[PDB]
Design a protein around this motif. Structure first.
Motif, short mmCIF file in Angstrom:
data_model
loop_
_atom_site.label_atom_id
_atom_site.label_comp_id
_atom_site.label_asym_id
_atom_site.label_seq_id
_atom_site.Cartn_x
_atom_site.Cartn_y
_atom_site.Cartn_z
N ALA A 6 0.84 -1.19 0.00
CA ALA A 6 0.00 0.00 0.00
C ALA A 6 0.87 1.24 0.00
CB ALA A 6 -0.94 0.03 1.21
N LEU A 7 0.38 2.28 -0.65
CA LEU A 7 1.11 3.52 -0.85
C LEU A 7 0.21 4.70 -0.54
CD1 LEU A 7 -0.03 4.46 -3.98
CD2 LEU A 7 1.31 2.44 -4.48
N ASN A 8 0.79 5.88 -0.35
CA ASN A 8 0.03 7.06 0.04
C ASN A 8 0.79 8.34 -0.31
OD1 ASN A 8 2.02 6.52 1.94
ND2 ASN A 8 0.71 6.88 3.73
N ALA A 9 0.05 9.35 -0.81
CA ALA A 9 0.69 10.57 -1.28
C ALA A 9 -0.21 11.79 -1.49
CB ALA A 9 1.39 10.31 -2.62
N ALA A 10 0.45 12.94 -1.67
CA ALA A 10 0.10 14.00 -2.62
C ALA A 10 -0.98 15.04 -2.32
CB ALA A 10 -0.27 13.36 -3.97
N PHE A 11 -1.29 15.38 -1.07
CA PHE A 11 -2.26 16.44 -0.87
C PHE A 11 -1.98 17.26 0.38
CE2 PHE A 11 -6.42 18.29 -0.08
CZ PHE A 11 -6.72 18.73 -1.34
N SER A 12 -2.26 18.57 0.30
CA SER A 12 -2.17 19.51 1.41
C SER A 12 -2.89 20.81 1.07
CB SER A 12 -0.72 19.84 1.76
OG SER A 12 -0.67 20.85 2.76
N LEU A 13 -3.32 21.53 2.11
CA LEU A 13 -3.94 22.85 1.96
C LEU A 13 -3.53 23.75 3.11
CD1 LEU A 13 -7.56 22.11 0.79
CD2 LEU A 13 -5.70 23.18 -0.48
N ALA A 14 -3.91 25.03 3.00
CA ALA A 14 -3.56 26.03 3.99
C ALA A 14 -4.80 26.82 4.40
CB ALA A 14 -2.49 26.99 3.47
N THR A 15 -4.73 27.39 5.61
CA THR A 15 -5.91 27.94 6.29
C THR A 15 -6.49 29.13 5.55
OG1 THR A 15 -5.09 27.17 8.44
CG2 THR A 15 -6.71 28.95 8.47
N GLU A 16 -5.62 29.99 5.01
CA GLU A 16 -6.05 31.18 4.27
C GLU A 16 -6.86 30.84 3.02
N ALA A 17 -6.66 29.66 2.45
CA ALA A 17 -7.51 29.21 1.36
C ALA A 17 -8.84 28.67 1.88
CB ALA A 17 -6.79 28.14 0.54
N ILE A 18 -8.81 27.95 3.00
CA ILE A 18 -9.99 27.24 3.49
C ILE A 18 -11.03 28.23 4.00
CG2 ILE A 18 -10.74 25.47 5.13
CD1 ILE A 18 -7.71 24.58 4.98
N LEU B 36 -11.21 31.02 2.46
CA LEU B 36 -11.53 31.79 1.27
C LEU B 36 -12.29 30.96 0.25
CD1 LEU B 36 -11.02 34.54 -0.27
CD2 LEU B 36 -8.84 33.55 -0.92
N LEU B 37 -12.08 29.64 0.23
CA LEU B 37 -12.77 28.79 -0.73
C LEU B 37 -14.22 28.54 -0.36
CD1 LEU B 37 -10.14 26.00 -1.51
CD2 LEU B 37 -10.82 27.86 -2.99
N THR B 38 -14.62 28.84 0.87
CA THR B 38 -15.98 28.53 1.30
C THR B 38 -16.44 29.47 2.41
OG1 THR B 38 -17.37 26.83 2.35
CG2 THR B 38 -14.97 26.63 2.66
N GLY B 39 -17.59 30.09 2.21
CA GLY B 39 -18.37 30.68 3.29
C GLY B 39 -17.80 31.96 3.84
N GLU B 40 -16.63 31.86 4.46
CA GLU B 40 -16.09 32.90 5.33
C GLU B 40 -15.68 34.18 4.62
OE1 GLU B 40 -13.04 31.43 7.80
OE2 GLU B 40 -12.39 33.39 8.54
N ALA B 41 -14.68 34.10 3.74
CA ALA B 41 -13.99 35.32 3.33
C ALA B 41 -14.61 35.97 2.10
CB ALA B 41 -12.52 35.02 3.09
N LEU B 42 -15.74 35.46 1.64
CA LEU B 42 -16.43 36.13 0.54
C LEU B 42 -17.09 37.40 1.06
CD1 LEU B 42 -16.56 32.85 -0.26
CD2 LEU B 42 -18.11 33.71 -2.02
#
Lengths: 49, 49
Positions: free
Chosen positions: B29-41, B43-49
């Motif tokens: 089994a293998l695993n990889a490849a994802f991350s995000l940051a708070t300033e996007a989260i 901004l991508l939904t609800g809050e910073a619009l």
């Protein structure tokens, strides 16, 4: 931007990275000069004919 | 299922048998490849619009 692999097992999970770099332009200058012959200026400009 | 060859004289006589082998399946089994940051989260939904 960079591509990733999907490593398996006893290692940290590879995470995607992006790299922004800023590189600055350069200013230079060239030159040349054709000094024109004195009496010939008067010969071309008129008033010696 | 193996063949054989008839053999003459002082050699002992051979007889057919067979082979049935069994093998297990490994688990990888293998695993990889994802991350995000708070300033996007924010901004991508609800809050910073």
């Amino acid at each position: 931007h960079q591509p990733l692999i999907a490593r398996d097992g006893p290692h940290p999970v590879e995470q995607p990275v992006h790299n922004y770099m800023t590189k600055v332009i350069d200013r230079r200058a060239l030159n040349a000069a054709f000094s024109l012959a004195t009496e010939a200026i008067a010969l071309l400009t008129g008033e010696a004919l």
